[PDB]
């Protein structure tokens, strides 16, 4: 009954190599290990995904091209192809599949891959810094065993890659809370977004405005997850916990702290379903480690010391060197009416789910 923790020196080094989040993976692992949390988990070395495994989602054309350039397809602007990007992609994909396979094998009820959760990538297109959609690959693998999977995406951005991947099916319900605002990436996921054809009503979207804080975010999340659990009754959960919601992120939109996300996490954990935990966004690296370390503590039912332990990256935690994050002084633009209207739509949509 012990959480699986996907890790290996090689996997972390590979993930540390992303130019936009250099060494984020080491900071996150280091802090966790500094709090000694790895000792209470089952460390599992990730396997690298095969072409056939990655092909469960991505097109052969896309994958063959990625490997080519690693030595079009959205591979520019936000998603430039660098050397070794294909080995990177395969590492993350295989790590999330390893997480899934553990859950299938009854090895654990919770399997953590903090450097996965790249939720924007499409079957044949990179997008939003995501080159391979390991979240989708995790779900497809779980799908070999579970008849109904719930995907919950708490990243700041709409989980469009995963939603699109399953928009026509009722076997995986996707739930995304996210900033929805003009010109804001990726532009999709209004509350009227409910999925298509046979997947109609099995996509759930909660559009949210700048400045939202812990209490309001949890009220929203809990009321939605309540309804979703009731109507859909999942057999397994995949949870993306992007940390770009946390106060002080370069994405500068929400005003969350890890305690708030933490409460959402606890709510999901009490369902006692096989749960696959993923990271994702998080562009303030020290804050992202703070968040994901605290959340590992939540997973472990542990209360962590507020003093940041001495470790490799201790100096990145100044000027206060504590675990807690203070909300900023920014306005909360979520009007209580709009929110209630949103919940009501969702409530109505879900009644169609049986």
């Amino acid at each position: 009954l012990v959480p699986v923790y996907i890790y290996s020196p090689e996997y972390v080094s590979m993930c540390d190599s992303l130019a936009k989040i250099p060494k984020r993976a080491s900071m996150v692992h280091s802090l966790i290990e500094a709090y000694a949390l790895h000792k209470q988990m089952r460390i599992v070395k990730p396997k690298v995904a095969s072409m056939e495994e990655m092909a469960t989602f991505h097109t052969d054309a896309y994958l063959q091209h990625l490997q080519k350039v690693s030595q079009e397809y959205g591979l520019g602007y936000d998603c430039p192809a660098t050397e070794g990007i294909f080995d990177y992609a395969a590492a993350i994909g295989g790590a999330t599949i390893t997480a899934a396979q553990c859950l299938i094998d009854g090895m654990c009820k919770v399997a953590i891959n903090w450097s996965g959760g790249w939720h924007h990538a499409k079957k044949d297109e990179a997008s939003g810094f995501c080159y391979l959609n390991d979240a989708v690959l995790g779900i497809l693998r779980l799908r070999r065993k579970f008849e109904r999977i719930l995907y919950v995406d708490l990243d700041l951005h709409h989980g469009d890659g995963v939603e699109d991947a399953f928009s026509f099916t009722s076997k995986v319900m996707t739930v995304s809370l996210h900033k929805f605002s003009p010109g804001f990436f990726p532009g999709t996921g209004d509350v009227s977004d409910v999925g298509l054809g046979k997947g109609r009503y099995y996509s759930v979207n909660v559009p949210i405005q700048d400045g939202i804080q812990d209490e309001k975010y949890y009220q929203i999340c809990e009321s939605v997850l309540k309804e979703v659990y009731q109507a859909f009754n999942p057999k397994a959960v995949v949870l993306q916990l992007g940390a770009d919601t946390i106060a002080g992120d370069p994405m500068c939109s929400f005003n969350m702290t890890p305690v708030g996300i933490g409460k959402c996490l606890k709510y999901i954990l009490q369902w006692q379903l096989a749960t696959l935990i993923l990271g994702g966004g998080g562009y303030n690296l020290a804050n992202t480690a703070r968040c994901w370390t605290y959340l590992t503590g939540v997973i472990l039912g542990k209360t962590l010391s507020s003093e940041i332990p001495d470790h490799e990256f201790f100096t990145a935690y100044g000027p206060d060197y504590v675990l807690e994050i203070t909300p900023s002084c920014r306005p909360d633009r979520n009007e209580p009416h709009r929110i209630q209207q949103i919940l009501n739509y969702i409530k109505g949509n879900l009644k169609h789910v049986v």
Binding site: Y77, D78, F129, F185
Partner: peptide, 5 residues
Amino acid sequence: XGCCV
């Protein structure tokens, strides 16, 4: 993030 964001 579509752009360098």
